[PDB]
Design a protein around this nucleic acid. Structure first.
Ligand SMILES: [Mg+2]
Ligand SMILES: [Mg+2]
Ligand SMILES: [Mg+2]
Ligand SMILES: [Mg+2]
Ligand SMILES: [Mg+2]
Ligand SMILES: [Mg+2]
Ligand SMILES: [Mg+2]
Ligand SMILES: [Mg+2]
Ligand SMILES: [Mg+2]
Ligand SMILES: [Mg+2]
Ligand SMILES: [Mg+2]
Ligand SMILES: [Mg+2]
Ligand SMILES: [Mg+2]
Ligand SMILES: [Mg+2]
Ligand SMILES: [Mg+2]
Ligand SMILES: [Mg+2]
Ligand SMILES: [Mg+2]
Ligand SMILES: [Mg+2]
Ligand SMILES: [Mg+2]
Ligand SMILES: [Mg+2]
Ligand SMILES: [Mg+2]
Ligand SMILES: [Mg+2]
Ligand SMILES: [Mg+2]
Ligand SMILES: [Mg+2]
Ligand SMILES: [Mg+2]
Ligand SMILES: [Mg+2]
Ligand SMILES: [Mg+2]
Ligand SMILES: [Mg+2]
Ligand SMILES: [Mg+2]
Ligand SMILES: [Mg+2]
Ligand SMILES: [Mg+2]
Ligand SMILES: [Mg+2]
Ligand SMILES: [Mg+2]
Ligand SMILES: [Mg+2]
Ligand SMILES: [Mg+2]
Ligand SMILES: [Mg+2]
Ligand SMILES: [Mg+2]
Ligand SMILES: [Mg+2]
Ligand SMILES: [Mg+2]
Ligand SMILES: [Mg+2]
Ligand SMILES: [Mg+2]
Ligand SMILES: [Mg+2]
Ligand SMILES: [Mg+2]
Ligand SMILES: [Mg+2]
Ligand SMILES: [Mg+2]
Ligand SMILES: [Mg+2]
Ligand SMILES: [Mg+2]
Ligand SMILES: [Mg+2]
Ligand SMILES: [Mg+2]
Ligand SMILES: [Mg+2]
Ligand SMILES: [Mg+2]
Ligand SMILES: [Mg+2]
Ligand SMILES: [Mg+2]
Ligand SMILES: [Mg+2]
Ligand SMILES: [Mg+2]
Ligand SMILES: [Mg+2]
Ligand SMILES: [Mg+2]
Ligand SMILES: [Mg+2]
Ligand SMILES: [Mg+2]
Ligand SMILES: [Mg+2]
Ligand SMILES: [Mg+2]
Ligand SMILES: [Mg+2]
Ligand SMILES: [Mg+2]
Ligand SMILES: [Mg+2]
Ligand SMILES: [Mg+2]
Ligand SMILES: [Mg+2]
Ligand SMILES: [Mg+2]
Ligand SMILES: [Mg+2]
Ligand SMILES: [Mg+2]
Ligand SMILES: [Mg+2]
Ligand SMILES: [Mg+2]
Ligand SMILES: [Mg+2]
Ligand SMILES: [Mg+2]
Ligand SMILES: [Mg+2]
Ligand SMILES: [Mg+2]
Ligand SMILES: [Mg+2]
Ligand SMILES: [Mg+2]
Ligand SMILES: [Mg+2]
Ligand SMILES: [Mg+2]
Ligand SMILES: [Mg+2]
Ligand SMILES: [Mg+2]
Ligand SMILES: [Mg+2]
Ligand SMILES: [Mg+2]
Ligand SMILES: [Mg+2]
Ligand SMILES: [Mg+2]
Ligand SMILES: [Mg+2]
Ligand SMILES: [Mg+2]
Ligand SMILES: [Mg+2]
Ligand SMILES: [Mg+2]
Ligand SMILES: [Mg+2]
Ligand SMILES: [Mg+2]
Ligand SMILES: [Mg+2]
Ligand SMILES: [Mg+2]
Ligand SMILES: [Mg+2]
Ligand SMILES: [Mg+2]
Ligand SMILES: [Mg+2]
Ligand SMILES: [Mg+2]
Ligand SMILES: [Mg+2]
Ligand SMILES: [Mg+2]
Ligand SMILES: [Mg+2]
Ligand SMILES: [Mg+2]
Ligand SMILES: [Mg+2]
Ligand SMILES: [Mg+2]
Ligand SMILES: [Mg+2]
Ligand SMILES: [Mg+2]
Ligand SMILES: [Mg+2]
Ligand SMILES: [Mg+2]
Ligand SMILES: [Mg+2]
Ligand SMILES: [Mg+2]
Ligand SMILES: [Mg+2]
Ligand SMILES: [Mg+2]
Ligand SMILES: [Mg+2]
Ligand SMILES: [Mg+2]
Ligand SMILES: [Mg+2]
Ligand SMILES: [Mg+2]
Ligand SMILES: [Mg+2]
Ligand SMILES: [Mg+2]
Ligand SMILES: [Mg+2]
Ligand SMILES: [Mg+2]
Ligand SMILES: [Mg+2]
Ligand SMILES: [Mg+2]
Ligand SMILES: [Mg+2]
Ligand SMILES: [Mg+2]
Ligand SMILES: [Mg+2]
Ligand SMILES: [Mg+2]
Ligand SMILES: [Mg+2]
Ligand SMILES: [Mg+2]
Ligand SMILES: [Mg+2]
Ligand SMILES: [Mg+2]
Ligand SMILES: [Mg+2]
Ligand SMILES: [Mg+2]
Ligand SMILES: [Zn+2]
Lengths: 99, 208, 99, 138, 83, 124
RNA sequence: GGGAUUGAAAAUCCC
RNA sequence: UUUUUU
RNA sequence: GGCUAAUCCCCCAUGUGGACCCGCCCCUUGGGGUGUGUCCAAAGGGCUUUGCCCGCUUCCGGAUGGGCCCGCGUCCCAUCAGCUAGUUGGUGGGGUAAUGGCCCACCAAGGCGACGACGGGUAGCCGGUCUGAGAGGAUGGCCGGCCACAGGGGCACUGAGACACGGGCCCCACUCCUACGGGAGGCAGCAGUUAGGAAUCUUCCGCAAUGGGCGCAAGCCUGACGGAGCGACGCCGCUUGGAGGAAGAAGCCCUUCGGGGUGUAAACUCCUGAACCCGGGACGAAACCCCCGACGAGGGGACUGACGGUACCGGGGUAAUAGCGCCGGCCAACUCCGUGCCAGCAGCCGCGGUAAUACGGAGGGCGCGAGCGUUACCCGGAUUCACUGGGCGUAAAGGGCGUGUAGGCGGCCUGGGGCGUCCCAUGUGAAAGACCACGGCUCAACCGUGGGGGAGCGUGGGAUACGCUCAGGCUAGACG
């Protein structure tokens, strides 16, 4: 089975490429509670179909570039920017906590 | 090499008759006769109430010294029994009673444990027709423990089997006295043994 | 001292010269053929491209190009010629390529 | 807002038994009602019944206790000696069917919520399913 | 070339072999593809040779190559007997 | 600490510091003596305890206790260091092995001869 | 370095 | 002043 | 500079077939078929020389080994907080077996980070191992698997495979030869030397076994391997005797001076017989090969030991090494003399300044015993980093207070989905180890055969209470 993931597009800004953010849930190995990690995958979008906020399935593929080993399978759900703004706000908080 | 030295001195320190001497632990000379107090300069002094450890220690020695075994083989035997299914207590005993050297004694081929040890070590003992010169060898149930016909004319063997005419044998043993054969029928039970030892004290010695 | 696996190094250098030279001719004819395609001369480019192909598949017979390495060059060659021949096309010889 | 309604209910019962209340109200929820059913079946409470209190539904829980005891401190033995929430919010506890515990060497229960419903441990092992471990009761 | 050969699993002066399928390039005692029997040269037990013929016959179909010894044993369990 | 807190920060394994910087954590280390002294001990006791400064093959210079009733240790003798402190002298963390290269064993020692490094005598 | 001194020492005192 | 609270 | 052979190199041919451009068909990333066009094959040798054996060529498939890619897991420091220019993506190209910024040209301006980027420190990883009731902690020697390296650094060539330990080139450090112009090296292979170090072996035998390379074979090579040697370094088995023997010798020790102790211990009586001598004397070894049969099946037959004259069997046969630690409490074992805060002991608490069971010796006793102690290190006791399993009024610990970002957490009812969670099946979880059973060395250690277990993840099927999510409703929280 080629691994299939489902995440949300957070970056339009490349050519023929979208950044998909894929959340994950699991119990902590020692302390047990359900914890929530999330990793960004660089997915291949040859037709520039998919846009910001689109929740898409992502599928393990033959390497397209560096950092690119997945293609966009299909659009599960379109246009939820709430997920994007959660990630935007977070990235924006990093401008404090320096000096 | 196991403990080699005075013995009817250990009869004394345990406060119980130890039959390692063979005969004369029966005759009124065992020194458990008219000297039941422990050896040394402070033997006749009033003993102090023993520590909870002191009790458990003297009880294992009571058992180990009876079978004439080094702590090494003794401890290995015990750790073996705590793994096998069944009561760690009794199983331990059945393993010491399965030692060939002890079996030879129990069968009355030799007077003492120590003498039975020398008879095995010197090849006078047959197991199922073959010679076995290892005292630690474990006897299985059903095996025939006989006297090698090379030594069947030896006066020490005819001596011990002379006194064995009509004497009864353990309910887990049986022997033919003329052909000098003998059989290990089954493992002995806790009840089968009259040993003056509380095993639960020995299990508790190794808990620490 | 003086192990006679030195003989292996001796032969190494002979094979070096054989392989080296075969490939030099491959490259020199391919560029010659592509040049003529770029210059519109259809017959001459084909007549040369055939020798390049023959030279390629011949180098695969030995241990020079043995693999699909031969097909790469053949594929890339025929592609470039037919495309470069898309400038007043008229593929005269038509020998190498397909109808 | 209430934080963990189940532990809240378990505690309402816990605190009420230590002063030997006859009854105690807990805010009404179906899931809570399914816990109360297992306890009522298992003999830890006389039982429960729905009831309104100022318009809003509640659940009266009718506790039970032992016989009055002999000299000093006549207060009876408890039927519920120990009630303890296990899988709380902020650390959730699920067990497979082989990971289901033996509570007080069989003399207690462990109320499991399973895909086949809220079951005691015995019922769940017999049904052959695991799930979220709600509490020990013994 | 995949081969059928013996690997030593006894102790010193107590050899015991595992008739074994492995690539000829691994160590004699190292990782192998399948165990297809055993061999006790000193014949200490009533059964000191076993094969599972039908499995040995498989590896010969796909081109395993037995040692002179492995073949001598496979012939004993009759891998090649054809009547 | 809430479970969440344990997920965020977690417990911290306690790092045990070594009481004996005999480097390479070796069982012994040999050195050459610098001084041989006699030092007054801590409060509840009084004596003249024999010690020695030692340059070690570890690159260290430390004091070491000379066990036994008498010693042949001089300013320049070479010795082997054991480890284990002398309670009642401060800053003395290592002992000296008696019966090693230049530190003779204790003469006329008849009871505990493994320690203090003396052989077995004959009885006529 | 020995006496006084203290349970014994420091100190102090005496050849 | 220092050890020892018997 | 010159001659020459070939299973060396090349050209033409035959095209089973394959390769490539294009078209079409089916599949769906570059998989399979098809048409036209183009391009591509080869090598001989041996005999029992009319037939067979060893090879050669193109293609399809199998088998084995491997390259590359992905999910998840993988130590410490935040007194490392911002990092990034081929850096992130794109188009075209180069390269390779093959994807890919792997490299290149041009275009866009991205990519990563508090879920720990970047930097620093440390370190091969795993099966397993030690420990622990477990959860965990620690560790990665030997054996097995993967990786990386071959004096340090870089690079390629040959080839199915290498960027190659005992192959090549270059730079650097070092040693050796040097006619000073220039050369040769590379034990982290086996042994062995030297240096460091508390410390780690034989410059051994053998190709008989197993395995590897080449050869039709005979055979050759193999410090892989199989054996021997040294070291109580570990484990296991074994001996230093057994039975009789005084209300009890001498000596030593204590003493109430009566006696008590070492102690059946010795002496001595009887018996056995570790060592050692003598004779016999292995398994590990049956194929390859030869003969019959067709060089098959099958049968038949012959040669082949390092260990080693070792194991083992039989005969003879001698009473024949004991040590080390401790005895104030924890902790089993106590008295005398010596010494007087000295000499010394001490793991901690503490002993010793004139009666010390704590120092030193003796007698005695306790504990182990070919060992026994010590030091170092690891886990344990330690619920003393507390998931199991701790805490913060006065013992270590509530931030001086608010506002609020991220995050964690979320009242009652219905429905959808089924992500978490649960069940079934199935694949995987190498071997060894661990566990149970039986068996082989006289036992054991050791070894063999069989059996069972297993968290995790893949896949298919299912359940929906709870948590998640989407849709709807309520008013007990909150707000107005
Ligand atoms: Mg999502
Ligand atoms: Mg875009
Ligand atoms: Mg994690
Ligand atoms: Mg963990
Ligand atoms: Mg856990
Ligand atoms: Mg697609
Ligand atoms: Mg789909
Ligand atoms: Mg997010
Ligand atoms: Mg047991
Ligand atoms: Mg049981
Ligand atoms: Mg009897
Ligand atoms: Mg019986
Ligand atoms: Mg234990
Ligand atoms: Mg050379
Ligand atoms: Mg050659
Ligand atoms: Mg040119
Ligand atoms: Mg041509
Ligand atoms: Mg090549
Ligand atoms: Mg819990
Ligand atoms: Mg599970
Ligand atoms: Mg349980
Ligand atoms: Mg549990
Ligand atoms: Mg069932
Ligand atoms: Mg390999
Ligand atoms: Mg098999
Ligand atoms: Mg057979
Ligand atoms: Mg068979
Ligand atoms: Mg061979
Ligand atoms: Mg066949
Ligand atoms: Mg037939
Ligand atoms: Mg973590
Ligand atoms: Mg977190
Ligand atoms: Mg931490
Ligand atoms: Mg260090
Ligand atoms: Mg230094
Ligand atoms: Mg240094
Ligand atoms: Mg110490
Ligand atoms: Mg004053
Ligand atoms: Mg006091
Ligand atoms: Mg010439
Ligand atoms: Mg020439
Ligand atoms: Mg041709
Ligand atoms: Mg054709
Ligand atoms: Mg086209
Ligand atoms: Mg054609
Ligand atoms: Mg050729
Ligand atoms: Mg011919
Ligand atoms: Mg001919
Ligand atoms: Mg000819
Ligand atoms: Mg394959
Ligand atoms: Mg493969
Ligand atoms: Mg560190
Ligand atoms: Mg970066
Ligand atoms: Mg940089
Ligand atoms: Mg750069
Ligand atoms: Mg490209
Ligand atoms: Mg290549
Ligand atoms: Mg490509
Ligand atoms: Mg462009
Ligand atoms: Mg992350
Ligand atoms: Mg994030
Ligand atoms: Mg680094
Ligand atoms: Mg390192
Ligand atoms: Mg264990
Ligand atoms: Mg760990
Ligand atoms: Mg480690
Ligand atoms: Mg680890
Ligand atoms: Mg590790
Ligand atoms: Mg080694
Ligand atoms: Mg191992
Ligand atoms: Mg080995
Ligand atoms: Mg390894
Ligand atoms: Mg791998
Ligand atoms: Mg390197
Ligand atoms: Mg290098
Ligand atoms: Mg080749
Ligand atoms: Mg390499
Ligand atoms: Mg390399
Ligand atoms: Mg070398
Ligand atoms: Mg060389
Ligand atoms: Mg050279
Ligand atoms: Mg140094
Ligand atoms: Mg040195
Ligand atoms: Mg060796
Ligand atoms: Mg061959
Ligand atoms: Mg021939
Ligand atoms: Mg040679
Ligand atoms: Mg070897
Ligand atoms: Mg031993
Ligand atoms: Mg005697
Ligand atoms: Mg005899
Ligand atoms: Mg043989
Ligand atoms: Mg034979
Ligand atoms: Mg041969
Ligand atoms: Mg013939
Ligand atoms: Mg045959
Ligand atoms: Mg004999
Ligand atoms: Mg004697
Ligand atoms: Mg005591
Ligand atoms: Mg001492
Ligand atoms: Mg005196
Ligand atoms: Mg005195
Ligand atoms: Mg006193
Ligand atoms: Mg004393
Ligand atoms: Mg003393
Ligand atoms: Mg003594
Ligand atoms: Mg030791
Ligand atoms: Mg510790
Ligand atoms: Mg702990
Ligand atoms: Mg601490
Ligand atoms: Mg806790
Ligand atoms: Mg519990
Ligand atoms: Mg605490
Ligand atoms: Mg609090
Ligand atoms: Mg205070
Ligand atoms: Mg405050
Ligand atoms: Mg607030
Ligand atoms: Mg919020
Ligand atoms: Mg909720
Ligand atoms: Mg939520
Ligand atoms: Mg639903
Ligand atoms: Mg639907
Ligand atoms: Mg599901
Ligand atoms: Mg499974
Ligand atoms: Mg396994
Ligand atoms: Mg374990
Ligand atoms: Mg057996
Ligand atoms: Mg299973
Ligand atoms: Mg599934
Ligand atoms: Mg309203
Ligand atoms: Mg209001
Ligand atoms: Zn007696």
């Amino acid at each position: 089975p080629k691994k299939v993931l489902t995440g949300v597009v957070v970056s339009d800004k490349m050519q023929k490429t979208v950044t998909v953010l894929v959340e994950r849930q699991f119990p902590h190995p020692l302390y047990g509670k359900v914890i929530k990690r999330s990793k960004k995958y660089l997915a291949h979008d040859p037709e520039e179909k998919y846009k910001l906020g689109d929740v898409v399935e992502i599928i393990e593929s033959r390497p397209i570039s560096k950092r690119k080993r997945f293609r966009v399978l299909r659009l599960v759900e379109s246009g939820r920017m709430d997920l994007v703004e959660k990630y935007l706000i977070r990235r924006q908080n990093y401008q404090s906590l320096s000096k | 090499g196991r403990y080699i030295g005075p013995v009817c001195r250990l009869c004394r320190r345990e406060g119980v008759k130890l039959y390692l001497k063979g005969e004369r632990c029966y005759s009124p000379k065992c020194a458990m006769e008219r000297r039941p107090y422990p050896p040394g300069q402070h033997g006749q002094k009033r003993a102090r109430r023993p520590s909870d450890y002191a009790v458990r220690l003297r009880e294992k020695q009571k058992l180990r010294r009876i079978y004439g075994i080094s702590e090494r083989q003794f401890r290995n035997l015990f750790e073996e029994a705590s793994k096998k299914k069944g009561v760690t207590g009794s199983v331990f005993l059945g393993l010491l009673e399965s030692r060939l050297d002890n079996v030879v004694y129990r069968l009355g081929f030799a007077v003492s444990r120590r003498q039975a040890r020398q008879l095995v070590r010197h090849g006078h003992i047959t197991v199922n027709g073959r010679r076995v010169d290892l005292p630690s060898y474990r006897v299985r149930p059903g095996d025939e423990i006989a006297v090698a016909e090379k030594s069947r004319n030896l006066e020490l063997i005819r001596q011990n089997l002379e006194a064995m005419k009509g004497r009864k044998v353990g309910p887990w043993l049986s022997l033919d006295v003329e052909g000098m054969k003998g059989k290990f029928l089954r493992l002995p039970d806790r009840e089968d043994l009259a040993l003056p030892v509380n095993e639960q004290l020995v299990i508790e010695f190794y808990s620490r | 001292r003086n192990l006679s696996a030195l003989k292996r190094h001796r032969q190494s250098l002979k094979r070096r010269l054989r392989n080296k030279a075969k490939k030099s001719a491959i490259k020199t004819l391919s560029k010659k053929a592509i040049q003529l395609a770029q210059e519109g001369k259809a017959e001459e480019a084909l007549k040369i491209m055939r020798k390049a192909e023959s030279l390629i598949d011949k180098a695969a017979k030995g241990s020079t190009l043995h693999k699909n390495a031969a097909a790469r060059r053949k594929s890339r060659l025929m592609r470039k010629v037919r495309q470069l021949l898309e400038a007043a096309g008229a593929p005269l010889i038509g020998g190498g390529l397909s109808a | 807002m209430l934080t963990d309604p189940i532990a809240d209910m378990l505690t309402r019962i816990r605190n009420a038994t230590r002063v030997y209340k006859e009854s105690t109200d807990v805010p009404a929820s179906r899931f809570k009602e399914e816990i109360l059913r297992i306890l009522a079946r298992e003999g830890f409470i006389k039982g429960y019944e729905r009831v309104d209190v100022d318009g809003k539904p509640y659940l009266r829980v009718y506790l039970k206790y032992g016989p009055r005891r002999q000299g000093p401190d006549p207060r009876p033995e408890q039927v519920i000696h120990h009630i303890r929430r296990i899988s709380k919010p902020g650390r959730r506890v699920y067990v497979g069917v082989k990971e289901i515990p033996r509570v007080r060497r069989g003399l207690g229960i462990a109320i499991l919520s399973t895909s086949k419903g809220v079951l005691t441990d015995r019922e769940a092992r017999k049904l052959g399913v695991g799930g979220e471990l709600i509490c020990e009761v013994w | 070339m995949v081969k059928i050969r013996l690997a030593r699993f006894g102790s010193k002066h107590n050899p015991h072999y595992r008739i074994v399928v492995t690539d000829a390039r691994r160590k004699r005692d190292g990782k192998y593809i399948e165990k297809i029997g055993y061999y006790d040269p000193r014949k200490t037990t009533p059964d000191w040779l076993k094969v599972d013929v039908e499995r040995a016959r498989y590896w010969l179909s796909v081109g395993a190559q037995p040692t002179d010894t492995a073949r001598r044993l496979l012939r004993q369990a009759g891998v090649f007997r054809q009547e | 600490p809430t479970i969440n807190q344990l997920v965020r920060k977690g417990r911290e394994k306690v790092r045990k510091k070594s009481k004996v910087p005999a480097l390479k954590g070796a069982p012994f280390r040999r050195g050459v003596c610098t001084v041989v002294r006699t030092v007054t001990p801590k409060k509840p006791n009084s004596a003249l305890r024999k010690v020695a400064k030692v340059r070690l093959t570890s690159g260290y210079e430390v004091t070491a206790y000379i066990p036994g009733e008498g010693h042949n240790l001089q300013e320049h003798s070479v010795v082997l260091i054991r480890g284990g402190r002398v309670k009642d002298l401060p800053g003395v963390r290592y002992h000296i092995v008696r019966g090693v290269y230049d530190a003779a064993g204790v003469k006329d020692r008849k009871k505990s001869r493994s320690k203090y490094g003396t052989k077995k005598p004959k009885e006529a």
